[PDB]
Scaffold this motif. Structure first.
Motif, PDB file in Angstrom:
ATOM      1  N   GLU A   4       0.840  -1.193   0.000  1.00  0.00           N
ATOM      2  CA  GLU A   4       0.000   0.000   0.000  1.00  0.00           C
ATOM      3  C   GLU A   4       0.876   1.244   0.000  1.00  0.00           C
ATOM      4  O   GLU A   4       0.681   2.168  -0.789  1.00  0.00           O
ATOM      5  N   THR A  39      -4.411  -1.497 -10.554  1.00  0.00           N
ATOM      6  CA  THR A  39      -5.683  -1.581  -9.837  1.00  0.00           C
ATOM      7  C   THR A  39      -5.576  -2.434  -8.583  1.00  0.00           C
ATOM      8  O   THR A  39      -4.609  -3.177  -8.405  1.00  0.00           O
ATOM      9  N   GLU A  40      -6.567  -2.328  -7.708  1.00  0.00           N
ATOM     10  CA  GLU A  40      -6.590  -3.172  -6.525  1.00  0.00           C
ATOM     11  C   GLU A  40      -6.832  -4.611  -6.931  1.00  0.00           C
ATOM     12  O   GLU A  40      -6.298  -5.535  -6.323  1.00  0.00           O
ATOM     13  N   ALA A  85      -4.605  -7.399  -5.502  1.00  0.00           N
ATOM     14  CA  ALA A  85      -5.176  -8.403  -4.618  1.00  0.00           C
ATOM     15  C   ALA A  85      -4.987  -9.788  -5.215  1.00  0.00           C
ATOM     16  O   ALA A  85      -4.765 -10.759  -4.495  1.00  0.00           O
TER      17      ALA A  85
END
Lengths: 140, 143
Positions: A129, B116-117, B121
């Motif tokens: 993150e 992108t997530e 992920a």
């Protein structure tokens, strides 16, 4: 060794010197260090300098700058229950013109403790993150 | 081999062992059962050499085609599989340490121009049991 290390690498479209700004200015760690509450450094950002850091809802921790190389990398060492954790931040240059940012966390040593690994995983969980935030800030 | 859009997870573990021994668990597809925890089926169309195609099936998942994109005894090997986020590249590196010990580093990477997530992920998921897989190789090699 008793070494184990996690790494995350993210390619970003910017200049190593601009990346270097967010690393070498401790007061700007808030933009990329998730949960950073307070940060300070006992002098110049150079190999060997000691500072103090605190994340939200956690005791403040002493750290030492291990290997500062301008525009390239810096590492910090913090003592933990599991010994010294070395945190690494590298700016790599890619052939296509981008740079890559690689952040790594490792436990100096330990005979593969079930709780050692679990410890690194938790520290490392926030890393992708944080590298993401740098990239989006640098690509502005 | 990284560039615009790419992301990559690495886990590295020091193992008290020799490179040739480690390499036997990589180069012999049928051995992957020792270190691939959810492995059900595994085959390769021929010899363990750069370019070779193969297939494998994991618990609760459909069979998957894969290619050996890079092979070097006894340093490393890499394979490529196609996914809903483009190709994922799995790397497996044997590195000789200055104290005699070796390190095994397993990495997974993909290319997502968007960052992108979803892609993140997805990669994170694949990387999630990689540290234990590497831990099994450690335990096995040190006996």
């Amino acid at each position: 060794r008793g070494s184990m290390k996690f790494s995350f690498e993210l390619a970003v479209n910017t200049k190593k010197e601009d990346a270097w700004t967010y690393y070498s200015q401790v007061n700007q760690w808030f933009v990329w260090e998730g949960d950073l509450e307070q940060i300070s450094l006992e002098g110049e950002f150079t190999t060997g300098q000691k500072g103090k850091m605190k994340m939200e809802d956690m005791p403040e921790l002493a750290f030492t700058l291990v290997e500062v190389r301008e525009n390239q990398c810096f590492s910090d060492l913090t003592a933990t229950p599991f010994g010294n954790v070395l945190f690494e931040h590298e700016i790599l240059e890619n052939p296509d013109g981008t740079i890559s940012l690689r952040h790594s966390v490792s436990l100096t040593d330990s005979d593969t403790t079930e709780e050692a690994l679990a410890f690194l995983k938790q520290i490392f969980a926030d890393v992708p993150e944080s590298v993401g935030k740098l990239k989006q800030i640098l690509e502005t």
